[PDB]
């Protein structure tokens, strides 16, 4: 797990393109040293350990680029989560007021998120296998398994977007229309974090009210995703942030 | 910063962005174009009908956020703008909602959009004093006439050597 | 020894830091390049014998 955070700058901003050449060369010569040009305008590096980062900057200042460069102090990359279920709802409706989405949030258990990380629950299965896995091990509902749509951040993200509101759920025309954008916005909110722009982990969101504009056309199709992630944030921030 | 003018470098209560990317507070950019038709972002003069208006959203806090994502727009958040619709939705919002899909429509309304109508507006990753004086100067310019004594009194010769080893003279160099 | 050679910064902003354990010269010498800007004419000595 790469966890250490190091921001770097040249002393005179003039030679920043050369500093960029150097950060290229280290990124190419190192396996998992990961650099990012962060929205604050900065250049952050994410790494493993003290000796690791030491020899990193040793080569950076020694070989690749010979500017003088300032270096901030080490810090961590963070995670976000909840402690208990979103006791109420804020529900987001598209810019053109066409789709009302009610969803809430709560905590999963650690183990199943661990399995999500283990690739043990690979949804590359059929929903049937999903159900076997889930109900078998952790007394999940079979219908909860039917309700699990996806996993958030990326291929392996420890959170789960679930859809459980039966009579409006059998609107498989409009919902089975909207699942794609729904998942886009979900993984959006999960990756970009509701509080501090770091990853969320091990959290369960449940869709309980999907009032879809009939023919959820490009109006929905386009103006649906920020609405979805705002639903995500509403649930989370409403009833219980945690670090 | 984000929502301040640039020629004033102060806040703009009503904005009108530049077709190039900055904030040209129309209230004074119209004074700038009505007194010297040029632009402060670029000293070259730029036409009038290009200064379109902009829409910075606002939350329960009033802050000039992005409407779509509900994301507060400050000096870090990437801001795109959609020209034809009149609305500005966050650059990440517009990007992942239209640069993944092929619905190149507006970001607030039901309107289409042009694949170049979105431009980056903010991205940190890129003497009458008294009667004594009046009557004095009257009588002076009246009764006062030109002067007499100090009027008159204001090898080589040696003015060079003199004026050189003496600062109390006007310098000849020849 | 006598010192070898002889304004504003942002990473030193006191509102953005978290001091949980305060840096000391032992650290600045253990990791010359991580814990020091402009580390010049430096030997990086380490031993896990």
């Amino acid at each position: 797990t790469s966890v250490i955070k190091i921001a770097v700058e040249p002393v005179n901003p003039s030679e920043l393109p050369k500093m960029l050449d150097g950060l290229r060369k280290v990124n190419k010569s190192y396996p998992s040293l990961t650099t990012k040009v962060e929205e604050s305008g900065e250049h952050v590096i994410l790494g493993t350990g003290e000796l690791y980062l030491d020899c990193v900057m040793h080569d950076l200042r020694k070989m690749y680029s010979e500017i003088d460069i300032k270096v901030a102090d080490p810090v961590v990359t963070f995670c976000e989560t909840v402690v208990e279920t979103s006791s109420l709802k804020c529900f987001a409706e598209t810019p053109n007021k066409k789709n009302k989405i009610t969803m809430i949030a709560e905590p999963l258990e650690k183990g199943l998120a661990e399995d999500i990380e283990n690739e043990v629950v690979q949804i590359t299965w059929n929903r049937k296998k999903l159900g076997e896995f889930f109900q078998t091990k952790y007394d999940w509902d079979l219908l909860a398994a039917r309700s699990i749509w996806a996993f958030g951040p990326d291929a392996t993200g420890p959170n789960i977007l679930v859809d459980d509101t039966l009579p409006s759920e059998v609107d498989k025309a409009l919902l089975g229309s909207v699942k794609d954008s729904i998942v886009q916005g979900f993984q959006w909110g999960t990756r970009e974090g509701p509080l501090c722009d770091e990853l969320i982990r091990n959290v369960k969101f449940k869709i309980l009210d999907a009032v879809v504009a009939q023919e959820p056309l490009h109006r929905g199709g386009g103006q649906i995703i920020p609405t979805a992630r705002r639903v995500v944030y509403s649930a989370f921030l409403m009833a219980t942030p945690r670090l | 910063p984000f929502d301040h003018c640039s020629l004033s470098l102060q806040p703009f209560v009503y904005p009108v962005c530049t077709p190039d990317g900055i904030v040209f507070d129309l209230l004074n950019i119209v004074p700038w174009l009505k007194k010297y038709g040029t632009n402060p972002s670029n000293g070259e003069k730029l036409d009038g009908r290009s200064l379109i208006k902009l829409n910075f959203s606002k939350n329960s806090e009033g802050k000039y956020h992005c409407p779509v994502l509900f994301t507060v727009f400050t000096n870090n958040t990437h801001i795109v703008a959609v020209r034809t619709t009149g609305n500005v939705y966050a650059y990440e919002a517009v990007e992942q909602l239209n640069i993944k899909a092929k619905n190149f429509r507006d970001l607030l309304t039901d309107e289409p959009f042009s694949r170049q109508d979105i431009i980056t507006l903010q991205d940190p990753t890129n003497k009458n004093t008294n009667a004594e004086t009046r009557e004095t100067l009257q009588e002076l310019y009246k009764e006062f006439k030109g002067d007499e004594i100090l009027a008159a009194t204001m090898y080589s010769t040696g003015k060079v050597s003199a004026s050189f080893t003496s600062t109390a003279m006007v310098p000849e160099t020849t | 020894f006598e010192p070898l050679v002889r304004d504003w910064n942002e990473f030193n902003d006191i509102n953005k830091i978290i001091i949980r354990q305060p840096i000391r010269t032992e650290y600045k010498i253990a990791f010359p390049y991580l814990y020091n800007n402009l580390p010049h004419h430096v030997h990086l000595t380490w031993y896990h014998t």
Partner: peptide
């Protein structure tokens, strides 16, 4: 002290990044 580690953590992390 411990009651406020995440409070600060957020304040300083956003102060750098989140605004």
């Amino acid at each position: 002290p411990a009651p406020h580690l995440a409070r600060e953590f957020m304040i300083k992390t956003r102060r750098r990044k989140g605004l």
